[PDB]
Amino acid sequence: TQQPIVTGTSVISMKYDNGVIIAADNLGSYGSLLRFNGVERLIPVGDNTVVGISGDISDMQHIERLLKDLVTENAYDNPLADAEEALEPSYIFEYLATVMYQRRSKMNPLWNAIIVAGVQSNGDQFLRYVNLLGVTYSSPTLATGFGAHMANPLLRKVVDRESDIPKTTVQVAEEAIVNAMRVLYYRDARSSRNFSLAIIDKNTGLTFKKNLQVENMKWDFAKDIKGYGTQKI
Amino acid sequence: TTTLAFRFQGGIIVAVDSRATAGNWVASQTVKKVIEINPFLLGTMAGGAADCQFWETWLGSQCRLHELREKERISVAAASKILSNLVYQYKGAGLSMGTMICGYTRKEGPTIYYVDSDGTRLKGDIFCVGSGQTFAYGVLDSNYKWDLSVEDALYLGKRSILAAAHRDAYSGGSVNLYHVTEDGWIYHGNHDVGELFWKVKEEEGSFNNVIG
Amino acid sequence: TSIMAVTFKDGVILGADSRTTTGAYIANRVTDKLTRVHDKIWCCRSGSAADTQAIADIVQYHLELYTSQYGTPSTETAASVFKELCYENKDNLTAGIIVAGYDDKNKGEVYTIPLGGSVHKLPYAIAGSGSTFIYGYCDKNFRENMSKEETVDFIKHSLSQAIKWDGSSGGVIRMVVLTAAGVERLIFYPDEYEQL
Amino acid sequence: TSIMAVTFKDGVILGADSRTTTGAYIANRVTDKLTRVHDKIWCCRSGSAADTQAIADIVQYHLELYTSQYGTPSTETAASVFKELCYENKDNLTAGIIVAGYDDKNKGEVYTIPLGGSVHKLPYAIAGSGSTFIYGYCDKNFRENMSKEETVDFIKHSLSQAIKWDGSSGGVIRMVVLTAAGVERLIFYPDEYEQL
Amino acid sequence: QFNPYGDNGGTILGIAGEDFAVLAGDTRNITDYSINSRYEPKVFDCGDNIVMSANGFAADGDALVKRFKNSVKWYHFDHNDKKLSINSAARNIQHLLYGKRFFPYYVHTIIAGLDEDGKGAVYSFDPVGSYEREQCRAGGAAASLIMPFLDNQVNFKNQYEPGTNGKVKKPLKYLSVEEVIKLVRDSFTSATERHIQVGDGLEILIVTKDGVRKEFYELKRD
Amino acid sequence: TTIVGVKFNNGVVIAADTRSTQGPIVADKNCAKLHRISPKIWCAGAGTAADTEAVTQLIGSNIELHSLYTSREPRVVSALQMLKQHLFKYQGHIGAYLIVAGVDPTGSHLFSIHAHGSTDVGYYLSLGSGSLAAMAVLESHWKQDLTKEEAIKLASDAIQAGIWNDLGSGSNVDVCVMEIGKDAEYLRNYLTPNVREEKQKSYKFPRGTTAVLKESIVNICD
Amino acid sequence: MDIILGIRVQDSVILASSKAVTRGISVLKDSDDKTRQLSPHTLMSFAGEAGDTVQFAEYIQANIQLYSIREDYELSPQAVSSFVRQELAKSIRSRRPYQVNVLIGGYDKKKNKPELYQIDYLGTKVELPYGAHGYSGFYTFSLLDHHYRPDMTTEEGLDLLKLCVQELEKRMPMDFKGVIVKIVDKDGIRQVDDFQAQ
Amino acid sequence: MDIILGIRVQDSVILASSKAVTRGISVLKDSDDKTRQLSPHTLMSFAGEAGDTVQFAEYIQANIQLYSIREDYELSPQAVSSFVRQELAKSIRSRRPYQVNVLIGGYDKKKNKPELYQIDYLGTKVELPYGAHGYSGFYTFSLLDHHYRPDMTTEEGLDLLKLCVQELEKRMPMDFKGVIVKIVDKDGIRQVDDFQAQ
Amino acid sequence: SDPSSINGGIVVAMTGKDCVAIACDLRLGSQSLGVSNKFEKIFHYGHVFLGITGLATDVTTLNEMFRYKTNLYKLKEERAIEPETFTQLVSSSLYERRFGPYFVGPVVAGINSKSGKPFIAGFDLIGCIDEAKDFIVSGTASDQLFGMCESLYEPNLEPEDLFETISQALLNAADRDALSGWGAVVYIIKKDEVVKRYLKMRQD
Ligand SMILES: *C(=O)[C@]1([C@@H](O)[C@@H]2C=CCCC2)NC(=O)[C@H](CCF)[C@]1(C)O
Ligand SMILES: *C(=O)[C@]1([C@@H](O)[C@@H]2C=CCCC2)NC(=O)[C@H](CCF)[C@]1(C)O
Numbered sequence A: 001t002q003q004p005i006v007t008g009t010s011v012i013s014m015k016y017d018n019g020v021i022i023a024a025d026n027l028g029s030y031g032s033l034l035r036f037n038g039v040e041r042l043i044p045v046g047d048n049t050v051v052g053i054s055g056d057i058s059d060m061q062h063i064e065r066l067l068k069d070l071v072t073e074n075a076y077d078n079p080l081a082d083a084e085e086a087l088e089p090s091y092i093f094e095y096l097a098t099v100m101y102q103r104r105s106k107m108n109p110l111w112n113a114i115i116v117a118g119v120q121s122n123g124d125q126f127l128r129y130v131n132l133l134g135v136t137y138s139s140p141t142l143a144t145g146f147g148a149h150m151a152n153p154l155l156r157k158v159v160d161r162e163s164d165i166p167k168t169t170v171q172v173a174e175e176a177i178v179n180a181m182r183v184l185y186y187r188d189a190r191s192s193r194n195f196s197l198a199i200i201d202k203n204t205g206l207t208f209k210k211n212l213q214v215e216n217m218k219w220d221f222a223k224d225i226k227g228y229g230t231q232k233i
Numbered sequence B: 001t002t003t004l005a006f007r008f009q010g011g012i013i014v015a016v017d018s019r020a021t022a023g024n025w026v027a028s029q030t031v032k033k034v035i036e037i038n039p040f041l042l043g044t045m046a047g048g049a050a051d052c053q054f055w056e057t058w059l060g061s062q063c064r065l066h067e068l069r070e071k072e073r074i075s076v077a078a079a080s081k082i083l084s085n086l087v088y089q090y091k092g093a094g095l096s097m098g099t100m101i102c103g104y105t106r107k108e109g110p111t112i113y114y115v116d117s118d119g120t121r122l123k124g125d126i127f128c129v130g131s132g133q134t135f136a137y138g139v140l141d142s143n144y145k146w147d148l149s150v151e152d153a154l155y156l157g158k159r160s161i162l163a164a165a166h167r168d169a170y171s172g173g174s175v176n177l178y179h180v181t182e183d184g185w186i187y188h189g190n191h192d193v194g195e196l197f198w199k200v201k202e203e204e205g206s207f208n209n210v211i212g
Numbered sequence C, D: 001t002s003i004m005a006v007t008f009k010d011g012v013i014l015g016a017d018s019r020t021t022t023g024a025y026i027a028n029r030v031t032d033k034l035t036r037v038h039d040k041i042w043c044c045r046s047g048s049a050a051d052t053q054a055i056a057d058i059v060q061y062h063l064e065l066y067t068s069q070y071g072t073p074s075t076e077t078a079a080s081v082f083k084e085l086c087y088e089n090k091d092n093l094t095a096g097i098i099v100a101g102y103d104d105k106n107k108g109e110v111y112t113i114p115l116g117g118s119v120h121k122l123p124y125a126i127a128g129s130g131s132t133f134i135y136g137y138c139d140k141n142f143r144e145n146m147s148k149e150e151t152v153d154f155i156k157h158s159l160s161q162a163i164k165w166d167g168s169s170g171g172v173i174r175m176v177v178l179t180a181a182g183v184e185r186l187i188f189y190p191d192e193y194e195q196l
Numbered sequence E: 001q002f003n004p005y006g007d008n009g010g011t012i013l014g015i016a017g018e019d020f021a022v023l024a025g026d027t028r029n030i031t032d033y034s035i036n037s038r039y040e041p042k043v044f045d046c047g048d049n050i051v052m053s054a055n056g057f058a059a060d061g062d063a064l065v066k067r068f069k070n071s072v073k074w075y076h077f078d079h080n081d082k083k084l085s086i087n088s089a090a091r092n093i094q095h096l097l098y099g100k101r102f103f104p105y106y107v108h109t110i111i112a113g114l115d116e117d118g119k120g121a122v123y124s125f126d127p128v129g130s131y132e133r134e135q136c137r138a139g140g141a142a143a144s145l146i147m148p149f150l151d152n153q154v155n156f157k158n159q160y161e162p163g164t165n166g167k168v169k170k171p172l173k174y175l176s177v178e179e180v181i182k183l184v185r186d187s188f189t190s191a192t193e194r195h196i197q198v199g200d201g202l203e204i205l206i207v208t209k210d211g212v213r214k215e216f217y218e219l220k221r222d
Numbered sequence F: 001t002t003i004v005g006v007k008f009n010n011g012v013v014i015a016a017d018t019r020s021t022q023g024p025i026v027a028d029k030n031c032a033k034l035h036r037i038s039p040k041i042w043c044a045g046a047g048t049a050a051d052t053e054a055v056t057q058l059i060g061s062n063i064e065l066h067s068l069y070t071s072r073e074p075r076v077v078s079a080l081q082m083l084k085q086h087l088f089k090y091q092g093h094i095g096a097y098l099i100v101a102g103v104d105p106t107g108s109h110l111f112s113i114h115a116h117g118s119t120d121v122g123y124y125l126s127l128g129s130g131s132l133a134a135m136a137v138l139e140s141h142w143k144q145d146l147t148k149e150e151a152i153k154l155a156s157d158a159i160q161a162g163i164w165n166d167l168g169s170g171s172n173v174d175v176c177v178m179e180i181g182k183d184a185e186y187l188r189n190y191l192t193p194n195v196r197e198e199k200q201k202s203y204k205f206p207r208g209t210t211a212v213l214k215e216s217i218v219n220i221c222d
Numbered sequence G, H: 001m002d003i004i005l006g007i008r009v010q011d012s013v014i015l016a017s018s019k020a021v022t023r024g025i026s027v028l029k030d031s032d033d034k035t036r037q038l039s040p041h042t043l044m045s046f047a048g049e050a051g052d053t054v055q056f057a058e059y060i061q062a063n064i065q066l067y068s069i070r071e072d073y074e075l076s077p078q079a080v081s082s083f084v085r086q087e088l089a090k091s092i093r094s095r096r097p098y099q100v101n102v103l104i105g106g107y108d109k110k111k112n113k114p115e116l117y118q119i120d121y122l123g124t125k126v127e128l129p130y131g132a133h134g135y136s137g138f139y140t141f142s143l144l145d146h147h148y149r150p151d152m153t154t155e156e157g158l159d160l161l162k163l164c165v166q167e168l169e170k171r172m173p174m175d176f177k178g179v180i181v182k183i184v185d186k187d188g189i190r191q192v193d194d195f196q197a198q
Numbered sequence I: 001s002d003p004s005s006i007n008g009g010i011v012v013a014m015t016g017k018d019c020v021a022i023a024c025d026l027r028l029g030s031q032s033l034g035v036s037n038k039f040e041k042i043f044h045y046g047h048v049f050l051g052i053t054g055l056a057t058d059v060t061t062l063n064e065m066f067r068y069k070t071n072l073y074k075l076k077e078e079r080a081i082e083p084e085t086f087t088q089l090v091s092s093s094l095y096e097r098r099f100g101p102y103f104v105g106p107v108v109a110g111i112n113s114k115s116g117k118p119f120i121a122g123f124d125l126i127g128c129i130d131e132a133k134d135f136i137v138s139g140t141a142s143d144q145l146f147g148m149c150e151s152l153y154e155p156n157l158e159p160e161d162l163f164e165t166i167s168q169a170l171l172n173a174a175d176r177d178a179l180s181g182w183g184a185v186v187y188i189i190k191k192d193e194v195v196k197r198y199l200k201m202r203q204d
């Protein structure tokens, strides 16, 4: 049993007609102190999977190392490591889910919430969540922490059920996610303006975008708000 | 829960209610509280359902193993001590069980052992275990006679559970009866307390305070 | 919260972030922590929003009655009323308040009243969770008798740093300028102060 | 405690106060929080004196055996050994450590390892209770590729502020300069840095 | 301090027919006041004509089901592909559950199938392995809302013959799979109206001598 | 609970869902969270129902009396000052979280009050467990100079975000529009997107089904 | 707790109350009468917290005797039980509640019928054919549920009580030192001095 | 706790032990024999935690019978009490200690003298003319301190015990259901089947 | 510990065509010990009916309080109180004890003597009013009651039909609650008359 020290906030994601999108800001908080700003919380594995992690950062770094080892190991005595026997997004998730549940069962968890986003070899979209309790689930949209409360409602207005997936384009989807990131920056006190976003398309492959920023924010109306009730000036 | 067992001229009577509750929630009115260890041995279950069910069934396995090894029927004293000693090994871990191990061997005759998760093992003539025990004891203590007929003994046991099913919120559903003879136990049916209460009230004239 | 008050050549300026939280959630991102208790006596509020509002409302009431009977109150007198309320009720209040006002004879003045109810007159004062991060910066960059432009800059740079490191601080930076010329309201948006 | 490490043009400099407390009592006022784990790989210790000493002693041992077998270790490798110890034993340790070393190919490098055992490579890093007070100052005054003289000044001014506001920091300011030229020990007394 | 348990909501229902059996459950998965998914299957076909659901703490529920499926697999390996009968599966699950008697799988589990006589069967378990064969059992959040209904509409409890002065009980004529499906659906729409953790969808798995079939119905999403 | 307030060009609108809960059970599927303080000052309440209702009626009573005493129309800032000082005094023990809005001789206003007595002002607001789903919508679609129709839409969508995504919210959407020169219009059940589907069966019992022991006429006339 | 039993037969009400008064490790008295006569045809038995028990009983006794003198009339058993229930219902929400449970047995001279009322310290009142406070009901109710008849004679009632006390003496862990029995009927209240072996 | 008394007279040791076995609210048995014969001339009585009590007694019994067979000799009472004290002294510092108190009464055939040993669960052993465990000593020691004489006959000892049990039945709050008495002397161990009225 | 789980008991009210019904069990226990099988939880003041579940001492007190208040009301108003008005009286009487509440779950049922309209309402222990059009549940088996009602209920049932429905809802809910049962009474209410029936049920 432990307690998280350096933490990463929300990880939001969703799937569209040809793939999945996943994003996460670049902050590493230390309680109320916004301590680190160059933190990458999106972990690409191969070119068909991206693992987004929130929660304890030291544990994230540990999971990172676990992931690199998976890749190294899978290549051992594997002439098809970059083909028929390359790591599938579903293998990566099952592995992490197994570790997460084993660790919680030993009462020594990896204090994280994880979303594995990717595209299977047959083209199918893959989006599944696993957390420190070993709990797992799938939905057209997935978000951790604060994003679960504010991002899911927005992303679900785009893809409210399975049938909405084939009707959603990368443009529409990426737009939703980028809007959600801005909302989170407005109401989440542990968020950052800078974030990374990744797209995994069954045709265009893995596109990883770094150093994005929340733009087009509305603050002007703030000048009109004075006092907390009766004050006029 | 209300479970009882008593020794008499004709062997042993075993009666139990069939209610299961978690707080105020009646999880079931049709639970089994008697484990048929084997054709000659019966065990009652009070306290933790899982603990009693699991270890009394395991006891059955130990008894069978004994009989294959010694080519002889296990005694009730020995059968009850297997359970007692097992339970004692777990003392402090949180097992919850109040039980009666009942058998009728040539060597011992009708025998009843009370065994609980505290590690207590008592041989006796009459035992009631459960939140309804005090009710059954009143009925049993004032009508018990060693010379009871198998017919009357069966009724007494059924009546004692009925008394408890009525007053104890955690007891009820139906009554399950058993008669234990040296040649094995004999099931004597399942009696829904709902129907049984009215029938007994009329025919007996008891439960006058209840409008029927 | 990050709030500060700075005296300068022509008077005094109050500044503050606009964030109110309930845990990690931003309940209000355009809060006005700069409150008027008299024409030229304002305060910066930190701690409990409910407590500081109640305190301020009572102070305003006291100074209004004071004015009706004895004319305009001194900034020192306003800080004494806040003090009385904060000290006498210290067991049930969570209020960190900075009082700032402009007097013609005294010019600008700043009094800080921390948790216990003690009063401290200072050239300038910072408070709120975000202030911890700018003690060094402010101590190095503050100078007495600065110009209006310089003071607005000192406060804008200080608070932008507080807002940067403190998750409990954010939104826009608000300022109130108190001088013989009157009362001026200033606001600075993220896009501006974040890239300082 | 107030400790920091800063990379600059010619390498890197480590700095720290010299105070160890047991409550409000100063158990030691001339403590050396700058510890050598290898010729040109040092660390700044904060948190538990007993834990950081034990960690350092073990790291030094590991790097000595590493050197005997594979030659001089990289600063990254030293930070990995600290990390391993701090992460794997996070439940029983209270150690905030900054690792700084000079490499000929990599020049100066700084890695900070906070309470959880996570590792962070940075241009510079500050830690210890006193650091909270200089986040704003350091963020405003730090520049990459500064000269030795400039870096010594940045660290001297930063720590003097940390020491000023933090009661858990004090004594003398110690520095260790790591460059191709070698290892240099610097010390600054109160009379000098207090009036900066 | 770290809490190894969680509550994912959900409700499940198992009803045994004369020659069939059903095991239903909503498809909503939650955490506190948030919905994790509107469609996360909770009732599984484990092979050998056995359906199972372990409702409560999802991580524990998945582990159990997964462990039991692997148990069926090895049963085949170790006993010349013999079919695992519903009663044997039940006893097996008891041991899987009791094995964690001191660090329980925080779930209410139910399995459905046909016994060896072809009759419909349902078994419901304790979080620690206590079990009983039953006619019908609701598990999870709305269980308290559903059972009463079932006692009345399936076992005709409290219902007497009109005119008999409650002296003649309403005869226990048994239901068909069509009639049972209706009770299941009404049970869930009613539960969905009064329990915030029930909703989104209802997935039912039907077991007959011909195998396992699935039906799905939407439930209110609020 | 999801309640919101949105100012538009010539007034202000407030909305709320209609779910009331006791733990995980829905005690009332169509409660009314919109309260009237005075004819043109309405309040949306979240938290402890008895408190939102009682506090709203107390201040409304005193506001009516004040109106009569001063021969003037009640002002929103008065309801706000009376509510906050009452709530402050009780240190949060009166669990009332309100969004108070209205039009008066000085214009249109929008405020929020928390149980402890702190107040806030804004162009758009929301409180309750559904607060976050709503605010996400508001932070995404709000703009200055909204028309009465746009406002009603925004507010209404914000509530839906709650009904659908918050387990604490559901059923219907109530709205109240307060426009500068007109009467306030209360729209009870402006939206009803959760009508229960027709049941699969009718459970009407045949007369005589229930066993009766005794019967008698009850005397009501004195 | 102590033993407090009550049985309402055809023309009377009988109250049986344990005689022991134990304080910690020692039984201080074995002849304690846990009863107070409220009026010629109304008796009240009680059990509970050490001092509250008698203080409450006597307080009620004083109030009823005062009512009797003022009105020169005897309140019906129902009226007295309502007065007592209200006193206890006020007490439960007071600074320090009376932790006392009681049985009121009275003979209503107007209706010409015996009445038994059971009231706990929360002010919970119920009218019964027979009742008890504490654990007493757990051992005796199954017996009363069985043998009780509305037309029982006082003599049959005493025999049924004797059976209850015997069950109590066999299965209960504490030695309550027997009981004192009192009968309330149309002629008042009298004590059965011979129950030590009836 | 239960009643465990011991008295060592001129040529024997007498052990009196309560017969009740109570579990919570009900007395489950009233004929329980809280004793185990360790050897022909050594008897041990015991009281304490529900399961530990018998498990411990029988474990000691098994070990002494094993020693008897191996050596074809009967350990002296002093030797047996030392063995028991050491078992309890190990137990007190183990994971889960045996919560059992005992009295060892034995007749030393070599010295031709009776011996009484009192040992608690901590392994505290003492040799006495008479002893007890629990609250029993509180009510009976003043009587024994008064009437005890080293030359008492078994008969006088029984009369003194009877007096102790009567004091216990009068002042103790619990009904321990009488006691079973056993005598240990040069001829072994025998039970006084007649103490229900001796 | 929980005041609303000491004595046990349930109450349920329903609306029908020009009628209303209110029913309750008759149990009064002391935790697991059944004490009385004749503890009715339904009372009436004029043509207004009040069912109260929860802590028995408060059920009795509240009844005595409302009898007292409706008696004075009639003496001043010179007419019997109506369902709507009484509901407000119940609500404000409960809130008056906001920080030291009566541990009860009241339910009001009746027909407005002037509009003939059927009326039912529920309250939490501090007066919050729930004015349902269909049904209202209260007591230790309220979950079971919600399940029974949400399924068995349908609009505009005739008095004789509503009787069967209200009864089956009550009975089957009570049999899944350890603290409810031991008898039951149902009230069928119409503008002109009111019938009270005692039901036959298990006694365990
Ligand atoms: C009786 O002992 C109880 C039964 O539920 C179990 C169930 C099956 C067989 C063993 C006995 N056990 C309880 O925990 C429960 C409540 C006790 F307060 C019960 C109904 O009395
Ligand atoms: C700042 O002190 C805080 C503000 O929310 C209030 C709000 C309005 C004016 C007074 C200050 N107070 C807090 O409690 C909160 C979180 C602190 F951890 C805040 C944002 O810092």
Ligand SMILES: *C(=O)[C@]1([C@@H](O)[C@@H]2C=CCCC2)NC(=O)[C@H](CCF)[C@]1(C)O
Pocket (backbone or CB within 6 Å): D001, D002, D019, D020, D021, D031, D032, D033, D045, D046, D047, D048, D049, D052, D128, D129, D168, D169
């Ligand atoms: C700084 O972190 C502290 C120093 O005493 C130790 C001593 C030697 C090197 C490692 C750091 N650690 C403390 O616990 C102490 C008080 C903190 F409140 C310190 C002075 O800050």
Ligand SMILES: *C(=O)[C@]1([C@@H](O)[C@@H]2C=CCCC2)NC(=O)[C@H](CCF)[C@]1(C)O
Pocket (backbone or CB within 6 Å): F001, F002, F019, F020, F021, F031, F032, F033, F045, F046, F047, F048, F049, F052, F128, F129, F168, F169
């Ligand atoms: C919303 O705030 C809640 C409502 O039940 C009440 C009921 C009527 C109007 C005022 C608000 N309040 C709650 O406590 C409940 C659960 C909170 F987790 C609710 C549904 O959110």
